[PDB]
Amino acid sequence: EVDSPAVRDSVLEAARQYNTSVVGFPIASKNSGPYLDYLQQLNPQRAERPVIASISIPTIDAHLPIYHGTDTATLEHGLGHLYGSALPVGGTGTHPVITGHSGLANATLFDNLEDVKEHDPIYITVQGETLKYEVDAINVVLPEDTKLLAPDPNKDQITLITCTPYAVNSHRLLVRAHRVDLDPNDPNL
Amino acid sequence: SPAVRDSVLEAARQYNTSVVGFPIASKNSGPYLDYLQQLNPQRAERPVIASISIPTIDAHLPIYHGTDTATLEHGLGHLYGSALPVGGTGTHPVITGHSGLANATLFDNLEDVKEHDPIYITVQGETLKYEVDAINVVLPEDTKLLAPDPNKDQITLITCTPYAVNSHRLLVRAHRVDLDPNDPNL
């Protein structure tokens, strides 16, 4: 059964193993061996567009699916995981980058990522498990300025990225967060 | 034979499209396993994936997959998470080697390489020529200069420096140039 603890445990372990192979950060033929392996991760049901994880950001009332990659069509319907960053299964040394659109008239998506503040919680649910992160940095940068996406071998971090669609020139909003302990009774779960 | 060599080279170019940043690994992960199959039509365990010639310092050396300790005792190592050294704009393979081993002469003389010196990579019977354009010494954590550039075909050679101190890293960067068929280093 896809939802069994045995399967979920194996899929999580497989994704942690995949993550050991991620050595840079994003600064790809979908037929390459590594991209094909990426697409098999977090997808024991072997579906074509699986939801790999979901994210909750209660301070902006956002609850959204995350998919593999950053195809145009994907980002009209949810969040994209940036290939070349770790999959969002936690671990010291990992730095998943999760992207979403702002401004699309029919879908809120990351429209309000700009209203997230320092210390706000972010919850990632993946293969039945929930990981809690807390916001520690908020930066608006030029789209080529990607230094802040680097992994740090002693931290378990994530960055959520969106565009600044009201600005005349293109920029990116980067909201960085670090792993924290999860209270089992946390209201938000 | 030529068709096998082209298919090996093409598979390596396709592998390279999957390489997304630069080196800032479980040997059984899918991507690492795929890496180890590249430049290895013989399906050997630790093949020489490419050879490098740096004539001005008399270095003629084998390049192997990865940078494991045992690898670097005997040869140069390709730094996993950089492009394989098969060329192309937007690629920046990084090749590392020690400079002070008792048992082998590897990158011992890399510090004598000068600006504009040639570097030749031979891979699957094809030779690629690079010309040195920067020589930098940095602390080991400082990897910015290894970034690929989408409009350049580049390579960096790395070694520990200075001799018997090894606090720093010598990075010799070179860019692709045309290979004249009568090059007097061939």
Report the chain B residue with the minimal C-alpha distance to residue A15.
Answer: B29
For residue A55, list its beta bridge partners.
Answer: A64, A124
Which positions in chain A touch B35 (Cβ < 8 Å)?
Answer: 34
CA distance A10 to A45: 13
For chain B, breaks with the C atom over 2.5 A from the next N come after 24
Phi–psi pair at B145, nearest 5 degrees: -65, -5
Residue A53: which H helix or E strand, with range? strand A51-57
Q: Is B80 on the interface with A (CB under 8 A)?
A: yes
Backbone torsion region of residue B177, taken as left when φ is above 0, otherwise alpha when ψ lies between -120 and 50, otherwise beta: beta
Q: How far is B147 from chain A (nearest CA, A)?
A: 9
Is A52:A81 a contact under the CB 8 Å cutoff? yes
Technique used: X-ray
Residue A97: which H helix or E strand, with range? strand A97-99
State the CB neighbour count (10 A cutoff) for residue A20. 18
CA distance B186 to B180: 10
Resolution of the deposited coordinates, in angstroms? 1.9
Active site positions of B, annotated: 98, 160
Is B79:B95 a contact under the CB 8 Å cutoff? yes
Question: Where do the H-state alpha helices sit in B18-160?
Answer: 30-37, 69-74
Q: How far is B162 from chain A (nearest CA, A)?
A: 26
CA distance B28 to A118: 39
Name all domains of chain A by residue range, CATH numbers in brackets. 1-189 (2.40.260.10)
Burial class of A35 by CB neighbour count within 10 A (0 to 12, 13 to 18, 19+): buried
CA distance B22 to B40: 23
Q: How far is A26 from chain B (nearest CA, A)?
A: 5
The answer to whether B18 contacts A34, with C-beta atoms less than 8 Å apart, is yes
- Size of the A and B interface in Cβ pairs below 8 Å: 77
CA distance B89 to A19: 27
A119 is an active site residue: no
Q: Is A188 on the interface with B (CB under 8 A)?
A: no
Residue B13 is encoded by which pair of tokens?
């170019």
